[PDB]
Design a protein around this ligand. Structure first.
Ligand SMILES: O=C(O)[C@H]1O[C@@H](O)[C@H](O)[C@@H](O)[C@@H]1O
Length: 242
């Protein structure tokens, strides 16, 4: 079900068919590790958001050829060396819907996002920013404050040390009936083969606002930055059928 795979040797020169831009490698770099072509994600002590002075992580945006605007999954693998301190969470990346803000305490009427976060002790959650001024029925899915977490009980200590963890995040748009969003959008998260699904989401307010891009932006927190200088390795970035 893999549609295409990102060539990391093209990450900083347009990404090939992935149509990559918005790149900020920061202190991170494409390299070889464990016989694989990887990004070594460098997270300085006291790095996290712009509130934190350390440099950590890396970011890029992709609009790959073959991006199905109605439903799509993105997948990657991550290696955490033994001793990595996961702190109280951080971001990997995910799918953005529509246009406008949908991250960093900013919401917009036209935009939304579906992202993977890690958690304490290697937990994983689905982390969603829903659009402003759009009905939801899922409890707690409000476009106020920061993003809304799901599957907290479901992936405790799912990310293991000294192994390639496999992560996937699936996003499927709601339908529309006479331009009215139908509260039937979906999200799923897969970590090392275990899948959890969230249904009944309003991902956007109109049928023109659909899945728009893959946004990668890995960093600690907020609000707690990296406790120490440390690294993780990311590889095998895939775009897959929902
Ligand atoms: O408040 C939420 O839904 C989530 O917010 C994130 O920032 C936290 O890392 C996570 O532990 C929460 O469950």
């Amino acid at each position: 079900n893999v549609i295409s795979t990102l060539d990391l040797n093209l990450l900083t020169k347009g990404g090939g068919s992935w149509n990559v831009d918005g790149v900020n490698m920061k202190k991170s770099a494409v390299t070889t590790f464990d016989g694989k072509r990887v990004v070594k994600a460098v997270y300085d002590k006291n790095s996290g958001t712009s509130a934190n002075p350390g440099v950590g992580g890396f970011s890029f945006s992709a609009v790959p050829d073959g991006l199905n605007k109605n439903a799509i999954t993105f997948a990657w693998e991550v290696f955490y060396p033994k001793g990595f301190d996961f702190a109280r969470g951080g971001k990997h990346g995910g799918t953005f819907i529509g246009h406008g803000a949908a991250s960093g305490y900013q919401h917009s009427k036209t935009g939304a996002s579906n992202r993977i976060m890690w958690q304490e002790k290697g937990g994983v959650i689905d982390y969603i920013y829903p659009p402003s001024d759009l009905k939801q029925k899922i409890p707690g899915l409000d476009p106020e404050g920061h993003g809304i977490g799901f599957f907290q009980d479901d992936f405790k200590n799912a990310l293991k040390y000294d192994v390639w963890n496999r992560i996937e995040i699936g996003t499927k748009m709601n339908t529309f009936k006479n331009g009215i969003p139908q509260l039937d959008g979906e999200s799923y998260v897969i970590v090392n083969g275990k899948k959890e699904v969230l249904k009944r989401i309003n991902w956007s307010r109109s049928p023109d606002l659909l899945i728009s891009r893959f946004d990668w932006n890995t960093f600690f927190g907020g609000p707690l930055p990296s406790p120490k200088n440390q690294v993780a390795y990311f590889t095998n970035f895939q775009m897959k059928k929902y």
